[PDB]
């Protein structure tokens, strides 16, 4: 049996009620990983945190990631929220460097060489770029550089990256080398959209008055699969 520690970094790259789904994706991922036995101290959550009590939310204080889903917001730690959701903090977290963090909980992936790491990002994207709710945006070269650095630190056995965004293939295609012990998958290729799901007017639809999608198809595809 695996004797290493399992870590995760969960990142919603957007803000605003219309982007409900990205923070819902991340909260769902948090609950799933906790149910799997990952410890709270090893799961680092980035979310702007403007959804659960958004005035447009039909169910104040809750977030759901499927039409009949349970609340997934309760229990999610507020590691990096609001303007603490930024690239410098994300990189400090991935590299396990508490002294490079600015604002937020200070939780980082201070991992060892026999540990596993799971990173899940959900948001908006375009060719070569991922959204953040603060300046600057998360650029493909910068993200791949920080993964290379982490590999140079040697502080994991293997790392898995799941990525939800438009043109998300562009973030790794021809940029992520073999030999880093990193496996990544993306919702889309480098030239096409990725899609929300559980959207008004579509089947199945969110409850009345949500007027926003509850999740993203690639994201709920893996999370609902892991559940069953």
């Amino acid at each position: 049996f695996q004797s290493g520690t399992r870590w995760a970094v969960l990142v919603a790259g957007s803000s605003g009620y219309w982007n409900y789904r990205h923070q819902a994706d991340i909260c769902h991922a948090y609950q799933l990983l906790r149910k799997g036995g990952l410890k709270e101290e090893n799961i680092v959550v980035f979310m702007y945190d403007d959804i659960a009590n958004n005035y447009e939310n039909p169910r104040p204080g809750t977030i759901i990631n499927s039409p009949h889903g349970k609340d997934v917001y309760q229990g999610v730690p507020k590691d990096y929220t609001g303007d603490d959701v930024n690239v410098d903090n994300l990189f400090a977290v991935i590299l396990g460097d508490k002294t490079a963090v600015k604002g937020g909980s200070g939780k980082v992936v201070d991992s060892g060489p026999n540990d596993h790491i799971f990173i899940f990002y959900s948001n908006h994207g375009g060719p070569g770029v991922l959204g953040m709710p603060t300046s600057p945006y998360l650029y493909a070269n910068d993200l791949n550089d920080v993964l290379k650095k982490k590999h140079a630190l040697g502080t994991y056995k293997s790392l898995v990256f799941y990525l939800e965004a438009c043109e998300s293939g562009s973030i790794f295609e021809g940029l992520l080398p073999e030999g880093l012990n990193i496996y990544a998958t993306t919702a889309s290729n480098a030239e096409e959209s990725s899609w929300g799901t559980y959207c008004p007017g579509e089947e199945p639809s969110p409850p009345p008055e949500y007027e926003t999608c509850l999740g993203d198809l690639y994201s709920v595809a893996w999370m609902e699969d892991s559940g069953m």
Binding site: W18, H124, A165, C166, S194, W195, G196, C213
Partner: peptide, 4 residues
Amino acid sequence: YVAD
């Protein structure tokens, strides 16, 4: 559907 909304795109990302």
